[PDB]
RNA sequence: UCGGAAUGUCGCGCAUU
RNA sequence: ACGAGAACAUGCGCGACAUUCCGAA
């Protein structure tokens, strides 16, 4: 429910200082990539390759912050970088599936409120 | 019951098996049966000037279904509608027990008609909405939001559907309306 | 007389029918259980007459967790539609319902508290004809999927030897299966037989009224005295003979009319194992011995 | 005296199993778990054994009969197969749905259009615990009856259960956990299935 | 009763794509996920797809009744092999092609080389007057994947077994050159059938003389 | 029903780019070699054949083409669906071209945009389905015209900027199944 | 880097019921 | 001597057809 609140608070239609699906695709592709990587595997804790590619997703988050200010404000407001941090801390499948679900809810609410 | 049922039921694909007193057994097309049940509730409120309510059980069974089973299930639904304040109709399965005003306005007029007109303006989409709604997961609500974004309908109506799904006891009415619409559009 | 209680937890959905295959019922009468027991005794090569004369069983009754159910007494209520629709009373409340103090909403709550099973109708097809240039035919079979903590219980009142015979018979009947489709996956159950203190104390009570617990029918002489001032429901029991030796083709049993469980009589009567077979190679036994519960009205 | 032999085991659905009743499978009406009706197993085994042995006295002796002058009690009481608890936990993990919706088409021979159909099938990993009772009536005829039962099981393992298994949906495999004479003193140690 | 079991591996040649809804890989990206067995989340060729493609190809090869309306009007060989459902003329199908699951060998070899069992092929459509390109993503099973395919043939007529297996030869050949399910006209679904064993598991029919390829 | 299979070697005059998401050229996940998608070839021949012949002013549904191209490359019109007589297969990296590349210090692809370096060959494989005996040859001439056009034009990428042109040579023309004559 | 992000069609039918 | 007893919710069916990862720089 936090995603809907964040999307509503950032409404202006301009969302997240101009963030669009075309700006989101570059990173959300990697997010769903690692999502399929975990979904194929069957293990309670994260696989090491998943951890490494999640770190790569985090640095790609920073790079997308550098690329466009809209993506940067999206990440700082939705804490998605902090979310990949905390799931890396937890290193469990349930939390990281929850984080992918969180990002899905974020993009779904962003699309709905446009 | 004996006489005015012919006038009230006029214009429906319905055969009245029996009225005979306080009760009523009715067989017809499912949609015509539901519509005439609502019209009957309104006409009975007009006849008795309030002061009297009747509960109903409405069932949807195929033909060559055991008539004993059909009547027994309809009576079971009627009994399910009896419990409580007795001013209820049990539509199809026992989970869908609604007040007469709730079924007439909240389910059909407010939800079924706008959804049907939206679908006509633009079936499987209703099916995936049902799949997302019947599950209690919050991310199923998120996926419903994404689907309503993708539906290319009037966005005011998609926000209305979001509001209906969010509210408890309004999601059930929305589900019943969608099931009614799906049964309306088949082959 | 030993009065052991037998508890039956059904592994599979069980098909009971009063009139039709598609029809589903949650319990059966004492007679239907007796017919199973008699078939099992004949299969097990046990003695028939001992079980016929000594055993006095009751109708199978619903039971869930923390409650045993008995048939609703057909007692005049000194808010009646709730009583009329009510069918089974918890044992701890049973004497209560006999004294009074039970109101309409409490009876409705008792009826709702019946957490025994869930009726359903499974549809199947017959392909015995499609091979012979034909077509399949669908048929519906009703059944009752009992809840995990629920099932059917019944008391039995006989001698020690009779109770041991019943123990062996029900041990075989666990795998024999009770129901109208016991050979097609339905009716499988497991039973546990033990003495229940609450039922012993309830039957120890000797009130002014007698309540039937089994589908029973008095002999004519006893029916002369027992029918006075009686409140009862007279159920029609009919069926088809189930045996490889009765006749070449299955024929209907003679129609029987027995008092339903819960019927209240001011004069007790010992029932009878009636014969409902005509021109058959063996005598079909329909159980109508009366299992009585005394209460104060 | 009269003997009942219990055969309890597992049915591993090697393919999606669709036993109809879109196009939903049959399920336990209370727990909504997928189930295999005992009538389904009994009918499939009877049809396969009739095809293999060709009603015949063996078929009627096994599965029962109602013909005039030949009323035979059904020796095989094939109880309903239930979704086993082991497979239930195996599917509670990985967050896997017990059933699945399979989309299929049908290209017409004239207009080359397809009609999509969504059939429900039990997922491959599922296991249904089955429990069948053989009613030993003739001690002499037990051996041949169990040979025919084994033949029917072998044919069914090379066949499908309910549904359009000619299109692949319904292949199963039996795993006999144990065979024990629950009733009577008959010797079932040498008796086996598969 | 005799059943002739054929077990082997169907090897993908060009990316094999059998469509179907479900839990989509790359959620929100692809518009045509491949059908995956939910238990293993592995790509799988449904046996219904193989059977339908083989039946269509064999019907086309043998000959199509002019203005055919239903499948049960096919040639008697087609009805005898893949089954018939004419009202009062039902013939049980002899071919019982199961779902071709993902093989363990191709599982381990794709675990090596870091393969993902699938590729999200990018394609697009170009209009004829506006020249606007509309993109699309379709999932495909990588060509190195091989599926363990397993079919059963029921022997109901001893005399017609040779003709039935000759027709199965023709159907298998046609399917080998033709594409399996998906947009194989654009190169999505070329397959090759490799046969490991054709043995009579149940019965006594002599299957040594029988070859489907 | 007859299938005529033609296997040939596309030879790349100038570096070609059909990369999916400039972007890296589309590579086979299995062999890790550059691969020419079949759909790209089929679309290019269909578009060139359509533009070569006269066209209706507006082709909104992409299905209103000339009847010959329509029967060659299929239909989608409601109730008049024609199966495509031509099936195009994915032309993967040739074994001979690969070995020639390992012979020198030459990579399969270059950076210019990842472009498959010129001089490579792809083993393309085409199937024609025989539906009308009297039409097979007429369809083949349209395929040849298309091939000829695809020799003059490009295949994907920045073709108008000078990358992606190829030449078609056919190793063999044979019917892989059916009684139709291959040498015809 | 900028755009297009899938689109057009069927969407269960046919035996018994 | 269980409103019983015998009975596969089954038979046929490709998630398929048309589609340039491209327009230019
Ligand atoms: Mg009334």
Coordinates of N, CA, C and O and ligand atoms in Angstrom, one line a residue, chain B residues 21-24 78 82, chain C residues 81, ligand 1:
Chain B
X21 N -49.9 -18.6 -2.1 CA -49.7 -18.2 -0.7 C -48.5 -17.3 -0.6 O -48.2 -16.5 -1.5
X22 N -47.8 -17.5 0.5 CA -46.7 -16.6 0.8 C -45.4 -16.9 0.0 O -44.5 -16.1 -0.1
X23 N -45.4 -18.1 -0.5 CA -44.1 -18.6 -1.2 C -44.2 -18.3 -2.7 O -45.2 -17.7 -3.2
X24 N -43.2 -18.8 -3.4 CA -43.2 -18.6 -4.9 C -42.1 -19.5 -5.5 O -40.9 -19.4 -5.1
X78 N -32.8 -20.2 -0.3 CA -33.9 -19.4 0.4 C -33.7 -19.4 1.9 O -33.8 -18.4 2.5
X82 N -32.9 -16.6 4.6 CA -33.8 -16.4 5.7 C -33.1 -15.9 7.0 O -33.6 -15.0 7.7
Chain C
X81 N -40.9 -22.4 13.8 CA -40.3 -22.9 12.6 C -38.8 -23.2 12.7 O -38.3 -24.1 12.0
Ligands
LIG1 MG1 -43.6 -19.9 3.4

